[PDB]
Amino acid sequence: KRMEDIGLEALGMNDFKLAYISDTYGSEIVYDRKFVRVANCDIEVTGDKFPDPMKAEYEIDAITHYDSI
Amino acid sequence: IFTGWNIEGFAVPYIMNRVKMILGERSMKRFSPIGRVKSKLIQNMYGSKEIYSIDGVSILDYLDLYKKF
Amino acid sequence: MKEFYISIETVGNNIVERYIDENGKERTREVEYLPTMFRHCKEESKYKDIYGKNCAPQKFPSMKDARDWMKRMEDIGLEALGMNDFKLAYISDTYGSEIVYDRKFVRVANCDIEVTGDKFPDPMKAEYEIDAITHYDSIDDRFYVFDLLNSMYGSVSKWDAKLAAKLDCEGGDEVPQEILDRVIYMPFDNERDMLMEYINLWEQKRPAIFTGWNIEGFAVPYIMNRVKMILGERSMKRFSPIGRVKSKLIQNMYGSKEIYSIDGVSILDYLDLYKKFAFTNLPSFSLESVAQHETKKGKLPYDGPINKLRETNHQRYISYNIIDVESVQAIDKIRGFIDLVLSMSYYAKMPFSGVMSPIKTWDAIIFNSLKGEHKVIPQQGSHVKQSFPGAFVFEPKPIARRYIMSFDLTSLYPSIIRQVNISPETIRGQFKVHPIHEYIAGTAPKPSDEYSCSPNGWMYDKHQEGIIPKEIAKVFFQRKDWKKKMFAEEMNAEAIKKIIMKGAGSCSTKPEVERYVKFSDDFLNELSNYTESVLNSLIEECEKAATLANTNQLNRKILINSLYGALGNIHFRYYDLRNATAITIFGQVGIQWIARKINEYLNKVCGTNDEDFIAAGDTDSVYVCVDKVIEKVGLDRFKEQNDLVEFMNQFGKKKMEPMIDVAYRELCDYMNNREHLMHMDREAISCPPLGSKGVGGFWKAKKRYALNVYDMEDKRFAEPHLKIMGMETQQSSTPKAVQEALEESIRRILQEGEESVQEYYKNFEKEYRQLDYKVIAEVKTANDIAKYDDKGWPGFKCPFHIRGVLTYRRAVSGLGVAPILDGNKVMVLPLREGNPFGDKCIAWPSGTELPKEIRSDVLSWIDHSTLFQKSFVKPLAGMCESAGMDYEEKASLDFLFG
Amino acid sequence: LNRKILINSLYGALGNIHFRYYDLRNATAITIFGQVGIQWIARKINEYLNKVCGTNDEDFIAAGDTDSV
DNA sequence: GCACGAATTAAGCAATTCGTAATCATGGTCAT
């Protein structure tokens, strides 16, 4: 912002996550899907009216969490 | 990764809201390694989706991972 | 008399403070404030969270260090407890104790402007030269009107007050003399020196609060934007004492308004002050309308563009602006609004502009009351705006309610929050909540036995008084304390007035008369022989005490009444949806429960079964028809209408009021809440005149009634007091005679009999054509004429105004009058069938008068027209039909059939 | 399928104001070059069909989009 | 909403329902 306010164009990345990943690995990345824990979840709640995700008035009575690893 | 059908509809938006209303806002933040969880409404679209963004876990709604690919 | 703050701002890490020193001279201090914040801690300390958790303080070198610390703790998700608005913190630490002030030494500025604009411009789009200078002062009590002697748009004569102080005929301009001496004047060579000296006046005469009727929507934007377009960033900044005067714009659904904030001075509009702190509903919120409402000093009604008035008859032009400003000043004298803002922002220890949004007005007071117990406020989180149930109104039966009483709740949401014990930290889980209908009927099972409840199913603690109810109480008892002081002060004033008319004596001594306490009888007896001078000084002191008490009472009332709108405002610090849907839904259950109990007791007393005695009601007030009891006792046994009103009055207190108390104590027992605080007394008694056929009040729909109220808040009326809402008697589209006739018809249909409303209809029908044509005729805006014209004939769905204007152009083609084009507001009226113009309409520019040649026939060809069926007969039917009556007697053979 | 997804969602980026390589001129040039291409092949197929069938002024393309005929 | 903030995606309408007018078929009664 300090350099922009004088009216010149900056060059490079503004979001450093991609920059960090690029420098840390650089070359092609080899991955095994097995080690990546991919959870999975569906919740069932019971109530008089449709349970409103935002009001959250009813009582969560079925959770049923799943795990890949 | 934390997939599942309609995860950013009646699952994450509810699990997070309930623990915030019954166990306090502090324990709800245990859901993330960084300990940083956030919520932003999207009234732009007719549906008021209080979508959450737990940091460290890539919330990928399978419904929206399916309608796209 | 002490030191206090006039305006606080923060630049970089230094906080500027315009303030009044103990001597009384304005100073501009600027200090390096050190922020003090709070954080979570596992170690015991005197600083605790609202939940009771241990909290650790922290002090910082500079404000920027704190604003970096917040970002630090907001990347690990730890609550950053403590006030995050340094301005509030500075005021609290700088003063701490209750702040005593003096309005005399604060510089309020009243300003109104009138541009030399042939066409009315945009406030931010400046295209016309400014000519009006006005800046009334409080500590200087002096106008400032420096006449623009000559300009780029012509030159004008000097403004002399002596000639303009008389009546129009005498050479004056109907403006009072006692205000003309205040006005100053000096000439000008152009507008550049005028702007220069205006900015100078801003510099040396720097006001505290810049107010005026619609000042933020007209003068401020226009004045600053002309300076910007001409001078530039130079001088434009001088408006602010610190130079941080910042380009601020607010895009709105109405377009683009450059709502501007001048740093170092609170730009508080007066239009919004009246719109917010008066609760008065007048259809025309223009300045002259409310002036005639309050000060009754209407201007001289001359129409036409005022461009010629700028050069010729400029004396009247300047007098218009003078009376324009004097109107706002008189509004202040009668309401004392800026006095209220000054007395309130010092109570809440916050910047003046804060009075606008109550969010701040509460976020500051609950803080500065929580400072005493060393408790520390929580960091604002992030919620989501949600629509939830709010106010409730019964469906009234559009019938003619003859004898009806009414009650109201003393304070709905404050008392609800006190009784249910609702607070951000007094929440302890839910219960099972059945459909609401079950709770109102009382059959639904008792929700719990350990805690307090609200019928949306959330259960809150009982014994521990919450922060929110405690603050509401600390406001409520202060309010009643100051009200009792005012009552004692008025009793003392009455005593002094009764003293001055009996006995006299010479004693010029003026001791230290005690304040904030009623004087002893002997002390007021010993100064009975004080003649008038010192006694009048004492009376003036009594009036000043009454004024301070009034300001305190009004600011207390506004505060308590705003806690709700704050607690449902997503951006409040102590927001919680459950808290919100537990004080609105409990309101609905409370009103429907009390309605059910009213019916259950009235059907019992009267004798009938399944009869709905509630006439109508809001969430806090109810009108119940009590005609059945009056019929049971008998109308003929009375002797005067005062007997009727007295019976209806004592019936509520002796019979209805204890029933109200018991049937709300049953609510308090039902959910086992903390304590019973609801009140309900006879706010209004409506009754028809004794012996008269009169209806005595009727409904029309949701919240459109009419009542011949005879007693309001235990104040007997020697004459009937009419009370209407929502009717069509105040809409601007109708002429004043139409509205007066409608209100007289209301008075008849309520108090007088059928023959009265019948004969008045025909009398007003005869008289209605005997007024001017232009006042009766309505006005419409005509755009895109070329879309709907074919040689003057009607087009495809040709609008009324378009047809009228086309026929008018066909009528006077080539006669030299100004043509009627699109975008100009045009007054329109129909014509009878068979008019020589060939069309049933006529249209010409509003206010303007059509040529005399076509003036005769258009008057003759509209005599006794039907237009008032579209104006006055239709609303009259809409009311009378719901009143169980008809205006024009529909004679028939029905009496032969039976 | 990764490559397919990548390529298919390209024009949905170069025509976006937040993709850093955004230009009004380019975002319109792609679209209307597509338009020109489809109408050009429409006219050419009409000409070829008229020539092979002998008749003239005959329209055979129907109800296409900016991709299909 | 204070004090910004740092990154950014939902567009423009197809379709229905209603009201009011404009035009058009069709009948009742009349000068003939």
DSSP of C759-795: HHHHHHHHHHTSS-HHHHSEEEE---GGGG-BTTB--
Q: With an 8 Å Cβ cutoff, are B21 and C578 in contact? A: yes
Break chain A down into helix, strand, coil percent, rounded to 5: 25, 15, 60
Q: With an 8 Å Cβ cutoff, are B14 and A42 in contact? A: no
- Token pair recorded at residue C606: 């009267």
* Contact (Cβ atoms closer than 8 angstroms) between residue C803 and residue C796: no
* Contact (Cβ atoms closer than 8 angstroms) between residue C751 and residue C689: yes
Distance from C-alpha of C202 to C-alpha of C196, rounded to nearest angstrom: 10
Exposure string over C66-86, b if 16+ CB within 10 A, otherwise e: beebbeebeeebbbbbbbbeb
How many contacts (CB atoms, under 8 Å) link B and C? 26
* Contact (Cβ atoms closer than 8 angstroms) between residue C6 and residue C18: yes
Q: Which residues of C touch A55 (CB under 8 A)?
A: 386, 577, 581
* Contact (Cβ atoms closer than 8 angstroms) between residue C215 and residue C267: yes
* Contact (Cβ atoms closer than 8 angstroms) between residue C649 and residue C682: yes
* Contact (Cβ atoms closer than 8 angstroms) between residue C690 and residue C644: yes
Chosen for mutation from C575, C577, C584 (greatest number of chain A CBs closer than 10 Å) is: C577
D44 marked ligand binding residue: no
Rounded to 10 degrees, the C-alpha dihedral B3/B7/B8/B12 comes to: -100
Distance from C-alpha of C472 to C-alpha of C484, rounded to nearest angstrom: 18
Q: Tokens 């976006």 sit at which residue? A: D16
Q: With an 8 Å Cβ cutoff, are B34 and C77 in contact? A: yes
* Contact (Cβ atoms closer than 8 angstroms) between residue C241 and residue C18: yes
Tell the burial category of C264 from Cβ atoms under 10 Å away from its Cβ (0-12, 13-18, 19+). Answer: buried
**From A35, which residue of chain B is nearest by alpha-carbon distance?**
B1
* Contact (Cβ atoms closer than 8 angstroms) between residue C342 and residue C20: no
Residue C570, Cβ neighbours under 10 Å: how many? 13
Break chain D down into helix, strand, coil percent, rounded to 5: 60, 0, 40
Asked if the Cβ of residue A15 lies within 7 A of any atom of strand E, the reply is yes
User: Which of B2, B5, B9 is the closest to A39 by Cβ?
Assistant: B2
To the nearest whole Å, the CA of B62 is away from the closest chain A CA by 10
What is the C-alpha end-to-end distance of chain A, expressed in Å? 45
Helix (H, G, I), strand (E, B) or coil at C713: coil
Contact with chain A for residue B51, Cβ under 8 A? no
Window C75-94, strand E contacts by Cβ < 7 Å = 84-87
Contact with chain B for residue A60, Cβ under 8 A? yes
Q: Which residues of B touch C76 (CB under 8 A)?
A: 34-36
Expressed in Å, this structure's resolution amounts to 3.6
Residue positions counted in chain A: 69
- Token pair recorded at residue C341: 């803002």
- Token pair recorded at residue C795: 């087009």
* Contact (Cβ atoms closer than 8 angstroms) between residue C851 and residue C820: no
Chosen for mutation from A43, A52, A67 (greatest number of chain B CBs closer than 10 Å) is: A43
Distance from C-alpha of C262 to C-alpha of C246, rounded to nearest angstrom: 7
Chosen for mutation from A31, A34, A41, A58 (greatest number of chain B CBs closer than 10 Å) is: A41
Sign of the Cα torsion C734, C737, C741, C746 reads positive
Distance from C-alpha of C850 to C-alpha of C844, rounded to nearest angstrom: 7
AA letter at C483: K
* Contact (Cβ atoms closer than 8 angstroms) between residue C425 and residue C452: no
Q: Which residues of A touch B21 (CB under 8 A)?
A: 56
User: Which of B11, B17, B18 is the closest to A41 by Cβ?
Assistant: B11
Residues after which chain D is broken (C–N above 2.5 A) are none
Bridge-partner residues for C638, per DSSP? none
* Contact (Cβ atoms closer than 8 angstroms) between residue C322 and residue C175: yes
Contact with chain A for residue C457, Cβ under 8 A? yes
- The approach used to solve this structure was cryo-EM
Q: E-assigned strands of C602-653?
A: 614-617, 621-625
- Token pair recorded at residue C855: 């003036």
Element (H, E) at C830: strand C825-830
* Contact (Cβ atoms closer than 8 angstroms) between residue C453 and residue C674: no
Q: Which residues of A touch C384 (CB under 8 A)?
A: 54
Q: Which residues of B touch A63 (CB under 8 A)?
A: 15
Q: With an 8 Å Cβ cutoff, are B25 and C429 in contact? A: no
Query: Residue C581 to residues C91, C438, C586, C720: CA-CA distances in angstroms?
Result: 34, 18, 8, 41
DSSP state of C120: P
Distance from C-alpha of C119 to C-alpha of C116, rounded to nearest angstrom: 9
Contact with chain C for residue B35, Cβ under 8 A? yes
Tell the burial category of C147 from Cβ atoms under 10 Å away from its Cβ (0-12, 13-18, 19+). Answer: buried
Residue C373, Cβ neighbours under 10 Å: how many? 12
* Strands laid side by side in the A39-41 sheet: A65-66, A39-41, B2-3
Chain E: positions less than 7 Å from a protein CB are 1-3, 5-10, 20-22
Closest nucleotide to C84's CA, by C1' atom?
Answer: E2
- Token pair recorded at residue C777: 């005729």
Q: With an 8 Å Cβ cutoff, are C577 and A57 in contact? A: no
Q: What are phi and psi of C158, to 5 degrees?
A: -70, 145
To the nearest whole Å, the CA of B69 is away from the closest chain C CA by 31
* Contact (Cβ atoms closer than 8 angstroms) between residue C747 and residue C757: no
